[PDB]
mmCIF file of C-alpha atoms and ligand atoms in Angstrom:
data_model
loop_
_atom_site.group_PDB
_atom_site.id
_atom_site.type_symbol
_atom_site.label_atom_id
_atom_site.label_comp_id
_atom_site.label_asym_id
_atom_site.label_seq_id
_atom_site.Cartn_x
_atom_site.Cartn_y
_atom_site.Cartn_z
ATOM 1 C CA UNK Y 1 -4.271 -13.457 -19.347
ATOM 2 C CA UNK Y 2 -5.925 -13.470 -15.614
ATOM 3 C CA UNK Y 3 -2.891 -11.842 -14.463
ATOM 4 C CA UNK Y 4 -3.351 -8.819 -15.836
ATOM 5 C CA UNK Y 5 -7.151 -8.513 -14.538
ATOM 6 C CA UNK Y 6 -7.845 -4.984 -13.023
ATOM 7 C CA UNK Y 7 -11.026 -3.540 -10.717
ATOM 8 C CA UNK Y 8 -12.448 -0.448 -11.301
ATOM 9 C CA UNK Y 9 -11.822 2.630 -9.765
ATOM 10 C CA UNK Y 10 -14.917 5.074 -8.740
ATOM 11 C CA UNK Y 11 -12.690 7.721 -11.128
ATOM 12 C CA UNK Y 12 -12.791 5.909 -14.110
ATOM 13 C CA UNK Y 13 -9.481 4.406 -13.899
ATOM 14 C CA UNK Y 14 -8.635 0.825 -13.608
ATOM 15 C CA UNK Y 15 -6.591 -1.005 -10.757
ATOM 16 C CA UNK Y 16 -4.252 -4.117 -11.537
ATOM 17 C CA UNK Y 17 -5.396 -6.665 -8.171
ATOM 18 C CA UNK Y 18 -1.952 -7.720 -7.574
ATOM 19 C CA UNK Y 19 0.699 -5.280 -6.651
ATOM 20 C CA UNK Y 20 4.190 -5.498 -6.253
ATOM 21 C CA UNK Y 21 5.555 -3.862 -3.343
ATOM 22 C CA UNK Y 22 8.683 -1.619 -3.117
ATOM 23 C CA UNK Y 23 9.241 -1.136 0.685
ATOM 24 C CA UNK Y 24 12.726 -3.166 2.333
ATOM 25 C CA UNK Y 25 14.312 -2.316 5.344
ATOM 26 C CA UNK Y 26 16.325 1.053 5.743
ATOM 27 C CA UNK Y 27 19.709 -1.528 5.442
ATOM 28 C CA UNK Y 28 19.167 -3.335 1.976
ATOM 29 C CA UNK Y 29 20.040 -0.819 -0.888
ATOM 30 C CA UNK Y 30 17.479 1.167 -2.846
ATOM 31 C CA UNK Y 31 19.526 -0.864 -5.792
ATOM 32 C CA UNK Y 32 17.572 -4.158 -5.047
ATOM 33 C CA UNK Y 33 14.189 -2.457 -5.793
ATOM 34 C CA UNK Y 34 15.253 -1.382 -9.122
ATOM 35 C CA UNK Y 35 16.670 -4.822 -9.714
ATOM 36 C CA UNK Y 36 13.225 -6.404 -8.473
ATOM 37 C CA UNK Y 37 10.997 -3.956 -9.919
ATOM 38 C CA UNK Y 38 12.283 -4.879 -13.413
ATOM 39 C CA UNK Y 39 12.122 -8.742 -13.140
ATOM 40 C CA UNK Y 40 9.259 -8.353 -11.300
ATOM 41 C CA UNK Y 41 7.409 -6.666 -14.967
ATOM 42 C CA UNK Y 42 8.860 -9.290 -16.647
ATOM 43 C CA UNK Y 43 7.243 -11.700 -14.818
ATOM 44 C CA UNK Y 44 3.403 -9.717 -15.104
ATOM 45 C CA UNK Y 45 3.510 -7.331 -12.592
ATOM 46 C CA UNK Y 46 2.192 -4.148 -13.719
ATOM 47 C CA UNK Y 47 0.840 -2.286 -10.474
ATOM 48 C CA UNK Y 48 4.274 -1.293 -8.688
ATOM 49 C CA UNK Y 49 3.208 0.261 -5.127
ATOM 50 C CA UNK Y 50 5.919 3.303 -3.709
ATOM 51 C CA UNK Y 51 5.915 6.140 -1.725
ATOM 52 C CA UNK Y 52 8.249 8.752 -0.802
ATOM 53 C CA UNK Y 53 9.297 8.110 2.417
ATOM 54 C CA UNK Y 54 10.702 4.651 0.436
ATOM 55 C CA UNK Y 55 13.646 6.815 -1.162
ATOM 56 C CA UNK Y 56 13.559 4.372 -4.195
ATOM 57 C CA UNK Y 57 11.883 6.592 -6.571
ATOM 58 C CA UNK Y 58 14.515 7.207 -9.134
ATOM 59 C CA UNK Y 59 15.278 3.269 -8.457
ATOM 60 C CA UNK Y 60 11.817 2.263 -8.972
ATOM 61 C CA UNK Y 61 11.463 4.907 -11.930
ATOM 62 C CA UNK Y 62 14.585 3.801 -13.740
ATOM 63 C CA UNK Y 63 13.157 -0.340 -13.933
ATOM 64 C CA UNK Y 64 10.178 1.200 -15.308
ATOM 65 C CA UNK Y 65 11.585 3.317 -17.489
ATOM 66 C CA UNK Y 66 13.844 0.176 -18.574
ATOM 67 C CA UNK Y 67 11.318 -1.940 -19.540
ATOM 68 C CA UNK Y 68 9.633 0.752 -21.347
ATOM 69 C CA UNK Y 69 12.451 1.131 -23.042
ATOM 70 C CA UNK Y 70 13.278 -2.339 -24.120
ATOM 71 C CA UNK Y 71 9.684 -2.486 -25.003
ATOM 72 C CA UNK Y 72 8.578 -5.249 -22.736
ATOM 73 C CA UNK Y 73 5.571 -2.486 -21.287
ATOM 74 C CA UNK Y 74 4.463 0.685 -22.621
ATOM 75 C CA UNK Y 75 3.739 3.336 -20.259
ATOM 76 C CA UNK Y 76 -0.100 2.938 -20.029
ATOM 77 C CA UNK Y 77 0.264 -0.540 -19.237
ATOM 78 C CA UNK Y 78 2.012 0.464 -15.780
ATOM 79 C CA UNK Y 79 -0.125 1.408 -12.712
ATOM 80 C CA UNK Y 80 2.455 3.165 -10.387
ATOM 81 C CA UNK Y 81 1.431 4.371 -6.924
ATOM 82 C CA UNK Y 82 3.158 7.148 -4.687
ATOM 83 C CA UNK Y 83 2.471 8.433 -1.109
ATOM 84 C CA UNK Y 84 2.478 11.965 0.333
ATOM 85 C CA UNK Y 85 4.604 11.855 3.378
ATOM 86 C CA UNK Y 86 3.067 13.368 6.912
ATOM 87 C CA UNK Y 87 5.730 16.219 6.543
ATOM 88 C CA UNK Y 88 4.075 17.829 3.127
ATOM 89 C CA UNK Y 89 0.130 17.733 4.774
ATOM 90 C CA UNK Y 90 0.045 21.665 4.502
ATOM 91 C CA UNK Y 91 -1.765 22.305 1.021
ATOM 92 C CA UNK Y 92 1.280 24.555 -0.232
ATOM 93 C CA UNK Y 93 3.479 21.425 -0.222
ATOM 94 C CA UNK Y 94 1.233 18.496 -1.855
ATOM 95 C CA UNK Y 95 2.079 19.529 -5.163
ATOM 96 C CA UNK Y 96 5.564 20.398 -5.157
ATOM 97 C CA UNK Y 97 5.909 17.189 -3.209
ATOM 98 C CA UNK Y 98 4.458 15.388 -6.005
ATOM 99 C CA UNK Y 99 6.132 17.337 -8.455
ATOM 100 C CA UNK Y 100 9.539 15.964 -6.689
ATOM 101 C CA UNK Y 101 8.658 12.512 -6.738
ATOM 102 C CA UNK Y 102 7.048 13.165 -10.325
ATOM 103 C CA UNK Y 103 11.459 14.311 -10.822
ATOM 104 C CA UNK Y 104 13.405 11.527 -9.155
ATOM 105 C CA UNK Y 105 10.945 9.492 -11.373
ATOM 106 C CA UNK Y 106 11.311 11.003 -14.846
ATOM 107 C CA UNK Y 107 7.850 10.304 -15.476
ATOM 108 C CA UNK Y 108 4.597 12.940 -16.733
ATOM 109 C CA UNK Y 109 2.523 11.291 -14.030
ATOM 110 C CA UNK Y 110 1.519 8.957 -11.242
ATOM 111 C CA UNK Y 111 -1.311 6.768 -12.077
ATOM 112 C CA UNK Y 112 -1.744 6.829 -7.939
ATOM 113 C CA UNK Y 113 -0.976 9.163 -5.445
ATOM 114 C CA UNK Y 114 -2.068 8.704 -2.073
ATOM 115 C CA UNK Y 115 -1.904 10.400 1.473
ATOM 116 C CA UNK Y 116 0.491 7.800 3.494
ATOM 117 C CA UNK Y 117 -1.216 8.426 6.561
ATOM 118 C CA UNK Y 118 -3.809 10.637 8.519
ATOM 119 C CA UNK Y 119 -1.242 12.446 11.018
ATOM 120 C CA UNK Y 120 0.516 15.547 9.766
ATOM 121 C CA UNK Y 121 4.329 16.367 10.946
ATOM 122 C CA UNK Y 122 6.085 19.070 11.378
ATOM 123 C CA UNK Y 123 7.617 20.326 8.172
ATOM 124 C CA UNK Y 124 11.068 20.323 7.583
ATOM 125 C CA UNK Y 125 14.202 18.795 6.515
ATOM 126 C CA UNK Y 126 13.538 15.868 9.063
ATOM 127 C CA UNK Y 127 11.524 12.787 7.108
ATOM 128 C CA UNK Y 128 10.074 12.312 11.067
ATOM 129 C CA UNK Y 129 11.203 15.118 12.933
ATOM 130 C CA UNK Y 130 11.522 14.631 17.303
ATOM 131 C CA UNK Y 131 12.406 16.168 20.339
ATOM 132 C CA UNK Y 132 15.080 15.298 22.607
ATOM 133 C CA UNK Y 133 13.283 12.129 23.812
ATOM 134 C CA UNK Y 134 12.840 11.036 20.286
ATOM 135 C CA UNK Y 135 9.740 11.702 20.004
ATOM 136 C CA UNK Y 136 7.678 12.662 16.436
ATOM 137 C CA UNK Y 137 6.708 16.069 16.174
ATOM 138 C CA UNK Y 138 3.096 16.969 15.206
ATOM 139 C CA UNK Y 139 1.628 19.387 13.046
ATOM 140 C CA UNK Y 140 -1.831 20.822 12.999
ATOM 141 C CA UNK Y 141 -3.242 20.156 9.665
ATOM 142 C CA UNK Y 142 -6.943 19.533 8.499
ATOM 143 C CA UNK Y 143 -7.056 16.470 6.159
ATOM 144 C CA UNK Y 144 -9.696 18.225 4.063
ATOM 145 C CA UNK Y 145 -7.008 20.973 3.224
ATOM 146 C CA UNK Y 146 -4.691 18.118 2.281
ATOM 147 C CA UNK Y 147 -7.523 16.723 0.423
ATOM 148 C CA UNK Y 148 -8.503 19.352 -1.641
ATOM 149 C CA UNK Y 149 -4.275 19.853 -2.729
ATOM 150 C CA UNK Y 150 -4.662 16.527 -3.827
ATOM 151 C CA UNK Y 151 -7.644 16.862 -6.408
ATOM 152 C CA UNK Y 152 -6.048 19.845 -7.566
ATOM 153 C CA UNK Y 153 -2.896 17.445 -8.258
ATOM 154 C CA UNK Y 154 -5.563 14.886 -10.473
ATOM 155 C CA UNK Y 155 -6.959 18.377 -11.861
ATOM 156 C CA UNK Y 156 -3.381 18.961 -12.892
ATOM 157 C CA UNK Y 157 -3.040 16.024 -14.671
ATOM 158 C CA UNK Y 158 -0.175 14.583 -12.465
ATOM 159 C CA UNK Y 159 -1.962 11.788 -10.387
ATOM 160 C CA UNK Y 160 -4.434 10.050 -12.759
ATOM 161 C CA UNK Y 161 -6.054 9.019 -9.857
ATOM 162 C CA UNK Y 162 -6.207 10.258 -5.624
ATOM 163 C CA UNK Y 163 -6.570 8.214 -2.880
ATOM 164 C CA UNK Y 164 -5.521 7.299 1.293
ATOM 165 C CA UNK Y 165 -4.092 4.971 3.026
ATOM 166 C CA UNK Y 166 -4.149 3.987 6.916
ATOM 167 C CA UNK Y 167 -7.298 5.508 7.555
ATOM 168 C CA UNK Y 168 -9.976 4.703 9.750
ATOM 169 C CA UNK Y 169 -13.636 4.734 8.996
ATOM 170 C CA UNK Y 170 -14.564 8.244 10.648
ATOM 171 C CA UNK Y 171 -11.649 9.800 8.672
ATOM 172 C CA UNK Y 172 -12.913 8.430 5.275
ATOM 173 C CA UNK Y 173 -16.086 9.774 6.466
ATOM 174 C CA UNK Y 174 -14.762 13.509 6.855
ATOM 175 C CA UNK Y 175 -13.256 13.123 3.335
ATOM 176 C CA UNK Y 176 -16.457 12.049 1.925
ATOM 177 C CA UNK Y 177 -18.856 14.475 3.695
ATOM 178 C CA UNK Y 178 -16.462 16.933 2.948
ATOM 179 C CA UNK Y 179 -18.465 20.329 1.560
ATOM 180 C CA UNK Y 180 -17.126 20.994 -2.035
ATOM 181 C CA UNK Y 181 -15.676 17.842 -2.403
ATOM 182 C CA UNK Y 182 -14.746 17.089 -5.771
ATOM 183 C CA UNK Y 183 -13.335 13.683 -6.055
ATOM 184 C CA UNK Y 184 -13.642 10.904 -3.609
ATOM 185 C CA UNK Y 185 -10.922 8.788 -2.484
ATOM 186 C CA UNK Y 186 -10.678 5.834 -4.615
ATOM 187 C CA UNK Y 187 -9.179 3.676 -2.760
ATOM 188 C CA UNK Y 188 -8.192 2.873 1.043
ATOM 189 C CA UNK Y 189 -4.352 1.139 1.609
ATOM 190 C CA UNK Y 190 -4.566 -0.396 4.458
ATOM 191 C CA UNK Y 191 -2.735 -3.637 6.327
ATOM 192 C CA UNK Y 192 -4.868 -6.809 6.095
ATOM 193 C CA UNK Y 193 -4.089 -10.681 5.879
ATOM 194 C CA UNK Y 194 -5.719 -13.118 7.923
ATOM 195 C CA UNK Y 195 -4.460 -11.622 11.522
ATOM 196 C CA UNK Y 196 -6.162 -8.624 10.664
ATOM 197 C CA UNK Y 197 -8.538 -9.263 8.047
ATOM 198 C CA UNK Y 198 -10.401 -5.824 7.817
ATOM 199 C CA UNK Y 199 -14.000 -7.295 7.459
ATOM 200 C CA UNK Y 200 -15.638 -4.121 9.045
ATOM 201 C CA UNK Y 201 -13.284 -1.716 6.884
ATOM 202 C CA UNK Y 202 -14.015 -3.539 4.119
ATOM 203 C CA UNK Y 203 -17.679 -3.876 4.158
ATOM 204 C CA UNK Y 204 -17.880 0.037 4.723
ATOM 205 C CA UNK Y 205 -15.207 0.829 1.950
ATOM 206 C CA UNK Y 206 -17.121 -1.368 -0.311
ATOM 207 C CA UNK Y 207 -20.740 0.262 0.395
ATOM 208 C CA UNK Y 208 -18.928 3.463 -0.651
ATOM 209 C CA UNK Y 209 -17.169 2.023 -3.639
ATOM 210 C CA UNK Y 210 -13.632 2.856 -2.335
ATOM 211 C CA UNK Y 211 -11.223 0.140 -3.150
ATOM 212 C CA UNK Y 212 -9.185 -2.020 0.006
ATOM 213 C CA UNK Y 213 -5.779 -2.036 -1.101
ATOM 214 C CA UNK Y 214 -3.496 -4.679 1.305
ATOM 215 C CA UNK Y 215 -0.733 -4.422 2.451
ATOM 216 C CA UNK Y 216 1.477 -6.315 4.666
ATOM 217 C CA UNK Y 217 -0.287 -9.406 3.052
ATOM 218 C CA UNK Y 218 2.471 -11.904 3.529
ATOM 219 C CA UNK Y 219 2.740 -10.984 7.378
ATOM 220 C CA UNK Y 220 5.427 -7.514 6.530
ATOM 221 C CA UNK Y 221 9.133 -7.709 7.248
ATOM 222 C CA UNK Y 222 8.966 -8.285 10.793
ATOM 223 C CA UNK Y 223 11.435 -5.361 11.857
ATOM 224 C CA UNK Y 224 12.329 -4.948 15.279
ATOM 225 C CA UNK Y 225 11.491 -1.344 15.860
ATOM 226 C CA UNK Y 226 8.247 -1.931 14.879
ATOM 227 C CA UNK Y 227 7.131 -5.360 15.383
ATOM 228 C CA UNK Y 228 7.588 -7.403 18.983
ATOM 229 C CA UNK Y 229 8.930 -10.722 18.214
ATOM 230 C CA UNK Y 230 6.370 -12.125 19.858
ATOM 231 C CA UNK Y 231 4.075 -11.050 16.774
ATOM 232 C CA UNK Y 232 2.248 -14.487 15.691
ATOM 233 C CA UNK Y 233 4.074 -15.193 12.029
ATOM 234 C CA UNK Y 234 1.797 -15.552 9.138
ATOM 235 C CA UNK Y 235 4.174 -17.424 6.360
ATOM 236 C CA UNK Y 236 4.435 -20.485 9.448
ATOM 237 C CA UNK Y 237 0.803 -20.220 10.307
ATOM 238 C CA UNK Y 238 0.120 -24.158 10.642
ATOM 239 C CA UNK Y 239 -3.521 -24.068 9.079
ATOM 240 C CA UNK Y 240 -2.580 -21.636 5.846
ATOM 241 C CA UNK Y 241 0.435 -24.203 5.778
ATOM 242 C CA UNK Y 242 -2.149 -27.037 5.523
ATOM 243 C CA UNK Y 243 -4.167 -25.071 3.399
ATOM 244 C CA UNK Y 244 -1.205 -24.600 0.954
ATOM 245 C CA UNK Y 245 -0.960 -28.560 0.898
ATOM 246 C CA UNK Y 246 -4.263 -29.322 0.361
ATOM 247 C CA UNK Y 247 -4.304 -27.305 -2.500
ATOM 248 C CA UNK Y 248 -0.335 -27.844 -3.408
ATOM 249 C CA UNK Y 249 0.595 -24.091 -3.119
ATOM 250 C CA UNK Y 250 2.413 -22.107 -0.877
ATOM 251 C CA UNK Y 251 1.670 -20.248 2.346
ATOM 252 C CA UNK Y 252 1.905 -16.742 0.116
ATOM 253 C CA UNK Y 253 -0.109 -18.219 -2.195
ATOM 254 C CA UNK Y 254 -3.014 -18.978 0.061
ATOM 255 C CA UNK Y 255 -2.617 -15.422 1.511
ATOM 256 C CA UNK Y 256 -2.273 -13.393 -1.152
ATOM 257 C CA UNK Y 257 -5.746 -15.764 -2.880
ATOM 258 C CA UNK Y 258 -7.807 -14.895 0.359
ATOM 259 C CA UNK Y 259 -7.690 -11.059 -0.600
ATOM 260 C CA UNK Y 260 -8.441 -11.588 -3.786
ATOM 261 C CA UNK Y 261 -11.343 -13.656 -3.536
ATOM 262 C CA UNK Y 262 -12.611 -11.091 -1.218
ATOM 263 C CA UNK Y 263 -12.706 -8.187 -3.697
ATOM 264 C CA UNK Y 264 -9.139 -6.994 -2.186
ATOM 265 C CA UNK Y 265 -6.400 -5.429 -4.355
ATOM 266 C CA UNK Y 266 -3.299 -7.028 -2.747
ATOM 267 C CA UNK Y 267 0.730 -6.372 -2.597
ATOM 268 C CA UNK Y 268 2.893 -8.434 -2.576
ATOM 269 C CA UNK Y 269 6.787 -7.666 -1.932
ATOM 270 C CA UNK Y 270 9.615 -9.893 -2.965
ATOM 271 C CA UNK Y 271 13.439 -8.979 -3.991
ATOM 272 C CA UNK Y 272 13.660 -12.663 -4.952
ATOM 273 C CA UNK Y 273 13.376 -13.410 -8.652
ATOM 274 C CA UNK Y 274 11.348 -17.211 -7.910
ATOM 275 C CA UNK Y 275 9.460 -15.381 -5.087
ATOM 276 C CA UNK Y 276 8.401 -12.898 -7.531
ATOM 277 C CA UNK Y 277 7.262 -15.609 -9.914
ATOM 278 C CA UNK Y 278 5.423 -17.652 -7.746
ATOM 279 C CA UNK Y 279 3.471 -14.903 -6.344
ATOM 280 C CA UNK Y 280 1.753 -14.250 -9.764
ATOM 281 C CA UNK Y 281 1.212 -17.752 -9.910
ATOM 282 C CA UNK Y 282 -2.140 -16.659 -7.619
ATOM 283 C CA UNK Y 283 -4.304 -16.197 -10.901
ATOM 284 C CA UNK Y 284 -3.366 -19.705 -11.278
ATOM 285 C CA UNK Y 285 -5.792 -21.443 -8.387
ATOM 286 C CA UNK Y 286 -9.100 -20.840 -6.731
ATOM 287 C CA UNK Y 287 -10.216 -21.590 -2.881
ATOM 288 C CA UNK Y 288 -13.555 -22.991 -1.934
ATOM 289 C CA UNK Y 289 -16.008 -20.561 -0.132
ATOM 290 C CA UNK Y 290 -15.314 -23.329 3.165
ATOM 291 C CA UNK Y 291 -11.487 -22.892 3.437
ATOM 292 C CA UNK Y 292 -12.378 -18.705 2.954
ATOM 293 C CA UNK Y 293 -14.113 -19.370 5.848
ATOM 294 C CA UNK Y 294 -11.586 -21.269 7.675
ATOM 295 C CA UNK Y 295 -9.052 -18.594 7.151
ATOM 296 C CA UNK Y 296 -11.435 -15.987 8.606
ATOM 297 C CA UNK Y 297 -11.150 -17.947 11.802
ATOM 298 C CA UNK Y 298 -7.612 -16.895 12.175
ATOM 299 C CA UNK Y 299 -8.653 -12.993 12.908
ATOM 300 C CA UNK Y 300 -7.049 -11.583 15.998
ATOM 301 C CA UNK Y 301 -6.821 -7.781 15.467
ATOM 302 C CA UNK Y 302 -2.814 -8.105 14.949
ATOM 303 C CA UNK Y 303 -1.011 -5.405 13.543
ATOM 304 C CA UNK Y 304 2.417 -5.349 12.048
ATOM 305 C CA UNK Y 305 1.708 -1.524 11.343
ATOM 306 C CA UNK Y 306 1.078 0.090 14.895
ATOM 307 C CA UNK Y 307 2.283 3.214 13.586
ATOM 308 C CA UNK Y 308 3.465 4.257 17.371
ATOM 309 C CA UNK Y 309 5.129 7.437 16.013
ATOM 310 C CA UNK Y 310 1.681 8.756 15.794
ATOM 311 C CA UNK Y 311 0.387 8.125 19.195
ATOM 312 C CA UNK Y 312 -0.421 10.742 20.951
ATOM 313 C CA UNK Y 313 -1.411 12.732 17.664
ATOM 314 C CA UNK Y 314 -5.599 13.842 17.451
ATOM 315 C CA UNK Y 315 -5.628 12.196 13.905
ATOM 316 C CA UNK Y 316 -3.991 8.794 15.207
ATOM 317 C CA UNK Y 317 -6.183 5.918 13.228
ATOM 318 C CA UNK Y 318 -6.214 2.698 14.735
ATOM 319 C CA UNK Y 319 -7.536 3.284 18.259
ATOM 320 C CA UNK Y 320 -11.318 3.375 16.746
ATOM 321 C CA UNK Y 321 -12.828 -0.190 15.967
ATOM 322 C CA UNK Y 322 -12.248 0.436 12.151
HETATM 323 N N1 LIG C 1 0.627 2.236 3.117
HETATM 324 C C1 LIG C 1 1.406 1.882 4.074
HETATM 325 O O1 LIG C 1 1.539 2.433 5.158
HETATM 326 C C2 LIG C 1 2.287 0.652 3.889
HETATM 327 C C3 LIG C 1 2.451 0.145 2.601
HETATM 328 N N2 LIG C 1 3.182 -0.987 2.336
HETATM 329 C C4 LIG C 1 3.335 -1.478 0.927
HETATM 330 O O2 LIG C 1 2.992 -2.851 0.921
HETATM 331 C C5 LIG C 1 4.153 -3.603 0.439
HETATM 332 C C6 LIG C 1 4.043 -4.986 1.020
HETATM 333 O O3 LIG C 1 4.108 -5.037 2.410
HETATM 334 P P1 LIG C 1 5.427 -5.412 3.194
HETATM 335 O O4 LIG C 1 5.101 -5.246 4.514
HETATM 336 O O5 LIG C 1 6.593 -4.729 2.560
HETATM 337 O O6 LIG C 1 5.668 -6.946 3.004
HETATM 338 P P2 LIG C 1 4.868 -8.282 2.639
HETATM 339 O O7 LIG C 1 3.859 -8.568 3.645
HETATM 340 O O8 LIG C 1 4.519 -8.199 1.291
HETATM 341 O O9 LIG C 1 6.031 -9.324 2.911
HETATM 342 C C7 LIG C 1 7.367 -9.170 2.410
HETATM 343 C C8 LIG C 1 8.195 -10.309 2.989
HETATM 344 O O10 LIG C 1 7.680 -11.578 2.516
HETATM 345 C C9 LIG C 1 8.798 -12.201 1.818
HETATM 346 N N3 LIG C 1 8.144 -12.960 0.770
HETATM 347 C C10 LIG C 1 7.628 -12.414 -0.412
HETATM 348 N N4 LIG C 1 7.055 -13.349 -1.193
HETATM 349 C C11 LIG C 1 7.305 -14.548 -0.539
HETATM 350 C C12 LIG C 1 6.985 -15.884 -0.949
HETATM 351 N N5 LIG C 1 6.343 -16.195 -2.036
HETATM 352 N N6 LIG C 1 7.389 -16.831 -0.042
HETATM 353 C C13 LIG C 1 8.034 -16.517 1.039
HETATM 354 N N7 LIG C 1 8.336 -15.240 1.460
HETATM 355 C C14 LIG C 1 7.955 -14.280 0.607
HETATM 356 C C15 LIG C 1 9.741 -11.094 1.429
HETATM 357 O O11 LIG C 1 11.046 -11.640 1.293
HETATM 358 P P3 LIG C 1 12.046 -11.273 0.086
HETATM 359 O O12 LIG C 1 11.730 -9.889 -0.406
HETATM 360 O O13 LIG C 1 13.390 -11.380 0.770
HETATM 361 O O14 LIG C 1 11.832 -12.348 -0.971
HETATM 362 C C16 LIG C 1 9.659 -10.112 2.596
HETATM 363 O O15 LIG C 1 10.454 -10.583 3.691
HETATM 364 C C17 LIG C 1 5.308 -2.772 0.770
HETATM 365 O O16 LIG C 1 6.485 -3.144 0.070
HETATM 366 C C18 LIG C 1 4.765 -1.414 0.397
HETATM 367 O O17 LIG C 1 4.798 -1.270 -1.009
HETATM 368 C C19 LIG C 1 3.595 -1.740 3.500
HETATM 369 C C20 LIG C 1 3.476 -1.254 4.725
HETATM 370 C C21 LIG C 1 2.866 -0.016 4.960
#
C-alpha cells in the first residue's frame, strides 16, 4: 500500500513520508493525543512525530503501546520521533533526557531523536526559564558537544536514528564539518508549506542527503502568542482552494501533496478522527509539474514559527537567508 511508502535515511534507516503530528495547544488535554494517536494507526499512520517539551509522552506511548497490543502494529512497524529540549543542550543531560522520555514512554527506543532547536537554555526546573521581564534565559552551549551526546545516544542503542530540527544552513554546516564526527544528521525538521516553502534549505539538505522533514504543513495552530492574526491563512488560501477543486480534494490535501512531490517528509496534525482519514488519503492523488509550479508562486518567507524566545541568543536560526 502507497501509504506506507518510506525514504531512506543516510543511517540506514527508513522514514515513513507522512507523519502524524502530536503538538495541540497548552489548553486541550494531553488525553486527546493518546486518543488521536491510536485512531490515527488505525487509519495508516505509522511515523508519530513528539518531543518533550509536548508533555504527551506517556499519552503518545500508551496509543502505541495499545495498538501493539491489540496487534493492529508491531513495534518495528512504528517510526516514533522525540526532541531534546534547549534546557538538556549540556552533553551530561542528552542522555538522561532521553532516557526520561525513553520512561514516560515504556519503550527500548526511539526510532528518532532530534535536537528541537539550535539555542541552549539555562538548565533547570523551568521548561523556558526568564527573568523578571519574562524574558528566556540563555545558556552557553556548543552544538557539537550536544552533537556528539547524541551519537553516543544511537551508539547506545536508544535512538535508532539522530537528527535536528530548526536549523539553518551554517549550523548544519558546523555539524557536518564537525572534526570526529561520527554520524551525520539525518534529517532537518523544519516549517515549510507554500508561505515558506524552503527551496534554498531544501536544495542544500538534499545535496547533503539530509532529509526535510515539514512541519507546520497545514498553516500550524495559529496561537496568539506566537502568531499575529494578521498571518496570511493557508487552509483559506483562494488558489490551493481552487487547486483542491480542480482536482476534487481538499485544501490539506493539496498541501500536504506539494511536499511530497518535492521529496519532503511531511506532518500532518489532526485530533479529528475524518481529518485524520482524509489526510492519508494524499497517497491517493498526484499534481501536475504546472500546478507544483503554481503553488511555488505563493512563497512569501512567512513564518508561523518565529521562535522569538530565542532572539537575542548567538545560535538564533532564522535571521540568515536559510
Ligand atoms: N520541530 C518543531 O519545532 C515543530 C514541530 N512541529 C510538529 O509538526 C506537527 C504539525 O504542525 P502543527 O503546527 O502542529 O500543525 P499543522 O500545520 O499540522 O496544522 C494543524 C491544524 O490543522 C487542522 N487540520 C488538520 N488536518 C486538517 C484537515 N484535513 N482539514 C482541515 N484542518 C485540518 C488541525 O485541526 P484539528 O486537530 O482540530 O483537526 C490543527 O488546527 C506538530 O504537531 C508537531 O508534531 C510543529 C511545530 C514546530
Amino acid at each position: 500500500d502507497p501509504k506506507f511508502q518510506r525514504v531512506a535515511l543516510s543511517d540506514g534507516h527508513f522514514i515513513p513520508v507522512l507523519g502524524f503530528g502530536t503538538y495541540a495547544p497548552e489548553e486541550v488535554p494531553k488525553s486527546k493525543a493518546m486518543e488521536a494517536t491510536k485512531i490515527a494507526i488505525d487509519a495508516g499512520f505509522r511515523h508519530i512525530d513528539s518531543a518533550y517539551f509536548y508533555k504527551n509522552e506517556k499519552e503518545v506511548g500508551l496509543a502505541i503501546r495499545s495498538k501493539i497490543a491489540d496487534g493492529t502494529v508491531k513495534r518495528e512497524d512504528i517510526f516514533y520521533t522525540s526532541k531534546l529540549w534547549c534546557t538538556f543542550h549540556r552533553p551530561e543531560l542528552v542522555r538522561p533526557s532521553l532516557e526520561d522520555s525513553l520512561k514516560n514512554l515504556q519503550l527500548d527506543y526511539v526510532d528518532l531523536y532530534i535536537i528541537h532547536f539550535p539555542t541552549a537554555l539555562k538548565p533547570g526546573v523551568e521548561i523556558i526559564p526568564t527573568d523578571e521581564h519574562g524574558k528566556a534565559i540563555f545558556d552557553t552551549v556548543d552544538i557539537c558537544a550536544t552533537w556528539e551526546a547524541m551519537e553516543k545516544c544511537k551508539d547506545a542503542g536508544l535512538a535508532k536514528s539522530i537528527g535536528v530540527s530548526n536549523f539553518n544552513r551554517r549550523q548544519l554546516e558546523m555539524i557536518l564539518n564537525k572534526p570526529g564526527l561520527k554520524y551525520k544528521p539525518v534529517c532537518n525538521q523544519v516549517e515549510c508549506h507554500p508561505y515558506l516553502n524552503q527551496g534554498k534549505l531544501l536544495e542544500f539538505c538534499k545535496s547533503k542527503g539530509i532529509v526535510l522533514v515539514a512541519y507546520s504543513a497545514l498553516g500550524s495552530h495559529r496561537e496568539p502568542e506566537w502568531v499575529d492574526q494578521s498571518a496570511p491563512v493557508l487552509l483559506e488560501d483562494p488558489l490551493i482552494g481552487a487547486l483542491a477543486k480542480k482536482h476534487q480534494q481538499t485544501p490539506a490535501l493539496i498541501a500536504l501533496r506539494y511536499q511530497l512531490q518535492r521529496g519532503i517528509v511531511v506532518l500532518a496534525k489532526s485530533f479529528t478522527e475524518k481529518r485524520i482519514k482524509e489526510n492519508i488519503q494524499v497517497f491517493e492523488f498526484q499534481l501536475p509539474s504546472e500546478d507544483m509550479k503554481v503553488i511555488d508562486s505563493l512563497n512569501r518567507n512567512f513564518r508561523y514559527v518565529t521562535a522569538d524566545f530565542a532572539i537575542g541568543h548567538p545560535n538564533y536560526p532564522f535571521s540568515d537567508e536559510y
